[PDB]
Design an enzyme around this catalytic site. Sequence first.
Site, mmCIF file in Angstrom:
data_model
loop_
_atom_site.group_PDB
_atom_site.id
_atom_site.type_symbol
_atom_site.label_atom_id
_atom_site.label_comp_id
_atom_site.label_asym_id
_atom_site.label_seq_id
_atom_site.Cartn_x
_atom_site.Cartn_y
_atom_site.Cartn_z
ATOM 1 N N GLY C 137 0.713 -1.178 -0.061
ATOM 2 C CA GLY C 137 0.162 0.040 -0.037
ATOM 3 C C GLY C 137 0.723 1.325 0.005
ATOM 4 O O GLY C 137 0.439 2.361 0.274
ATOM 5 N N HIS C 142 6.529 6.821 2.787
ATOM 6 C CA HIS C 142 6.370 7.916 3.534
ATOM 7 C C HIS C 142 7.802 8.079 4.141
ATOM 8 O O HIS C 142 7.823 9.187 4.797
ATOM 9 C CB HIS C 142 5.551 7.517 4.716
ATOM 10 C CG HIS C 142 4.260 6.793 4.248
ATOM 11 N ND1 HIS C 142 3.757 5.696 4.691
ATOM 12 C CD2 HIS C 142 3.223 7.342 3.600
ATOM 13 C CE1 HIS C 142 2.403 5.577 4.434
ATOM 14 N NE2 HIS C 142 2.084 6.484 3.495
ATOM 15 N N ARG C 175 4.114 3.135 -5.500
ATOM 16 C CA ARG C 175 3.030 3.963 -6.508
ATOM 17 C C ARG C 175 4.012 3.971 -7.730
ATOM 18 O O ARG C 175 5.214 4.204 -7.748
ATOM 19 C CB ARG C 175 2.419 5.333 -6.286
ATOM 20 C CG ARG C 175 1.367 5.200 -5.320
ATOM 21 C CD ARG C 175 0.044 5.450 -5.993
ATOM 22 N NE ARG C 175 -0.498 6.755 -5.839
ATOM 23 C CZ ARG C 175 -1.561 7.205 -6.747
ATOM 24 N NH1 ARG C 175 -1.553 6.873 -7.873
ATOM 25 N NH2 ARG C 175 -1.853 8.502 -6.324
ATOM 26 N N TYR C 194 -7.605 -1.606 -1.796
ATOM 27 C CA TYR C 194 -8.873 -1.355 -1.029
ATOM 28 C C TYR C 194 -9.447 -0.114 -1.978
ATOM 29 O O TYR C 194 -9.026 0.808 -2.118
ATOM 30 C CB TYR C 194 -8.766 -0.915 0.297
ATOM 31 C CG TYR C 194 -8.186 -1.806 1.059
ATOM 32 C CD1 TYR C 194 -6.816 -1.888 1.257
ATOM 33 C CD2 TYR C 194 -9.019 -2.856 1.600
ATOM 34 C CE1 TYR C 194 -6.279 -2.969 2.073
ATOM 35 C CE2 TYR C 194 -8.623 -3.654 2.522
ATOM 36 C CZ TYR C 194 -7.196 -3.819 2.648
ATOM 37 O OH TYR C 194 -6.838 -4.744 3.450
#
Lengths: 284, 283, 284, 283
Positions: C137, C142, C175, C194
């Site tokens: 995810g 981050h 990503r 999700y």
Amino acid sequence: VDSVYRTRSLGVAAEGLPDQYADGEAARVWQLYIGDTRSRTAEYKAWLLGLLRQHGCHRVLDVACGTGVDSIMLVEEGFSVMSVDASDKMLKYALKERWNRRKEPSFDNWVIEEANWLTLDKDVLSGDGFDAVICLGNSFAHLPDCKGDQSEHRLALKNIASMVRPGGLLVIDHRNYDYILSTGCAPPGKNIYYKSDLTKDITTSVLTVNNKAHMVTLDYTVQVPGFSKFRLSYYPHCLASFTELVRAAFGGRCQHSVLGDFKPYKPGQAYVPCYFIHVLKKTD
Amino acid sequence: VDSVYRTRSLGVAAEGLPDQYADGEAARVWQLYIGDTRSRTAEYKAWLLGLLRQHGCHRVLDVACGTGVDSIMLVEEGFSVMSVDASDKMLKYALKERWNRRKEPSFDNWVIEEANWLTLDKDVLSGDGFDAVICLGNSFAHLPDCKGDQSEHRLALKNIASMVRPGGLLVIDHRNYDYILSTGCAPPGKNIYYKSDLTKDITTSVLTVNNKAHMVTLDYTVQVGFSKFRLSYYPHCLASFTELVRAAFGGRCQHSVLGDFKPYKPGQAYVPCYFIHVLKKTD
Amino acid sequence: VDSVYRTRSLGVAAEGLPDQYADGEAARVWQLYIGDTRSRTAEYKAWLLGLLRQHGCHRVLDVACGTGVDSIMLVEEGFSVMSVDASDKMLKYALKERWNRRKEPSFDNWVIEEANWLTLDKDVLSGDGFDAVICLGNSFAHLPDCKGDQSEHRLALKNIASMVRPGGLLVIDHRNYDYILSTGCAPPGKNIYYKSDLTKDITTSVLTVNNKAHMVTLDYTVQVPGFSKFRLSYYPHCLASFTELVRAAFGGRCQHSVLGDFKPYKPGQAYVPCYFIHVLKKTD
Amino acid sequence: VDSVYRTRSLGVAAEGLPDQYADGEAARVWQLYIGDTRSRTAEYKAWLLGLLRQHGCHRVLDVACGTGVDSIMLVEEGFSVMSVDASDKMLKYALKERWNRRKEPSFDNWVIEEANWLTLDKDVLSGDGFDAVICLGNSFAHLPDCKGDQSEHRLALKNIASMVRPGGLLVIDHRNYDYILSTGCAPPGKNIYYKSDLTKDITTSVLTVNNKAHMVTLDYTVQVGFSKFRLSYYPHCLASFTELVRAAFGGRCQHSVLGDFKPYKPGQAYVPCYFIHVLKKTD
């Protein structure tokens, strides 16, 4: 992650652009506040003009000079005046009125320079000293006790004091904080120097650290063409404490009196002064 | 509880006291940086002095004037110069030199006043209009696109432009941002106006929002010692700017664009550091 | 004067009182955002469940675990799952759902603990290693490049990687930033894990430092019962760079494939993946 | 230009990452400070345990519950305890111990939930009402007077009070601020509940607004090493508080006020560190 990107550093300036916070709200009310010196009181003109003349003072330094109002009068009455302050934002207005009135010789000969109480000795070639040094309108009190022990207060006075020629005077003042700490209120419209014109409202916030009074912080609420706010802080100099501080500044070698509001001060008198003025002379 | 007590408001000043951040570190290096104008380039003296002279300019307005170095020259060379800037901290120094040099007439007659690009119309009694209006050294780029549509850039130019008297000149410039945006790096020491004296080091940070370039932020890192400050810039690409500045006169203009002082033919070998735009009015 | 009084320190908490900024606006939209995991995609359930099963993985660590959704499934399907994350605000929700479902043995046996990629080695007694380590995810992203040289990225992967048992797998993702840097847009509603339910709008801001891409910062604009905003930032890992980073993490001793969105990835294929998943196995 | 770019908003969190200021210095000393509850005083155990028991209290709500130490006792002693607090960072630790001790029934049946004094009514399905409601260790004082009129103090008590079942108890306390405001100093290590273990040093800053005392701010300065944090408090003078808390039940109450656990006769020799207010309802 919690970094903090910024478009320019705190303290810098770019050419097309208004500085830092200069266009903001507090700044614009506060500009009204400092420009609130149009009626100088006659009593004060009488007293200071007569204090200097009475002691033959002609070379005078106005430390913490602001927009320069007190200095403008000194200049006007034929004194020889050097005026310093550590703040460009306020010195701008001294500088301005001086250009504006540049044709007048009295004013061509007006000196306005930057200097800082804490470095005053190196920042002003004192020569063999000044006749009078004035620091009026309660500005010494802007100097905070950052270090905790009042060592800065002590150095600021030591420096200011050293500006004073033998047998010369230091004329320095403070609001009656004794009373302010007492009522817990700093009354508005009580400025004995320039009767105020702005109608303004005031909240007084007193910080007491380990049971010693540490700050008075005033939030002003003013009306414009509007209800705008701003905040300033002060060190509350109780009369004893300041008396001590300022005396010690000349070592001890002084004549020392302390004024009511321009009238003398007998401790325990019915009248409660709004400011205490300290007139100091020296040694020999 | 998370309240934030302050001892004075942002933007005010008290008398015994240095202002806000004036004593801080970045402010002191940056004071070095803006006082870094001692050698004006002889090429520039020549050019601008010659620009104004061949178009018979005598009444000139230095918009965004700063410490006032360009203005000090114009004054010195017997022009009739009014200089404005919106920045006190900068104006201080023009004001300062002016007083310093006040016994020279050419200088007593120098006018230094505060005014803001966005309110320049009602900030400067423009009279008939000015002969030349100079805005040099890349300062237009200091005006950011806060609203998101460049409407402020547009007003700023419109106001500036309206300061210009019929048949008069607007001389306005910007770095070559096209290049800056191609390489990603804003080279240090390319200031064509004032040969820099200060061994300085530069980190270029470009911000791109929804794919449109939005900001150049420069981190100047200076030998005094090893200190830093940061400045930001709106990157005007040559087309965009040419469009903006043309439209500012509606469209009634004689528009040329300079290399670094020499003309500019698009696709020429030499890549300029600045783009100078010399405009005149036709109605 | 310009001090800065504060009623409590950054980072502390008092008992009657909501913490720091927890009641604010961005926080409340952002709580919608992270709780936006109700429809897990069937494709993803199929793929990960089949990845683990295919390699006989039963002991798994979910590093950067969040509210714990990916972990909840692992737990549900009879895996043996330890889940760590460095953020209490998110771990609160893993912890919560775990209590909520405490009767279920599968879940009594769920381990949720705090740990930090940069100290992961000391923060998780790895034993003789884990079968699978999942970090899905796009959370590796981050981790910012604070020091400037990507040495932190390198240490975070080295640590994560070391969690992996010989012949085990690391399943880590990002990503497609290659594309994001290209369009300059980070598309919303493209989460392959999700499927998102919140209708949300997105402004993409890319910071490029000395011509190397340094940050993607996304400002989200969401609708409630209302138009509230919040901002998150990411390190843009181009596919080459991440490939290198992650390989080097195991020294070099690896099988390494990289997935499209769950399907394989042949560089120069017509389909442009929204995420790249890196499945790594080891040595012997 | 003076814009302020941030990498994430105040109040959010991302996964690989420690939150906001959780890793910082003041947070780490302060974590020492709130985990400084190992020796609960035997006197306090005795007292509260005996307070509840003689008034037949079994269903108790620990408002403002923190790491949950008071609650851990009540649970342990076979009470039926629901503990709320508005602070995640604190609740973490009650939650933590609870899980840690989850195989004991007395504890499986412990309820820990988030709720806020100002919304306590619609935050806790109060049922018939609670037997006892405890708010101990001086935490009411953490609620500041933001609006200026103490209307928030008033609502907070009203809500708390309404949690109390007819004939039930509210046990709520505050430091002796009257004293704190007389001396100007908040002495360290007078916590009557949890004998402090931490060599700590304290600077007392009192804020007085238009002559009304408005805040106590304490700067705790701790030996770990030599680090600091600051906490602030609303100083409730005994009268004020007695008034506030009485009014909270309208006025239908059996109100007594404790010294430090022993009764309080105004003008007695012994100056208490805390004031404990034990209230019951009459309608």
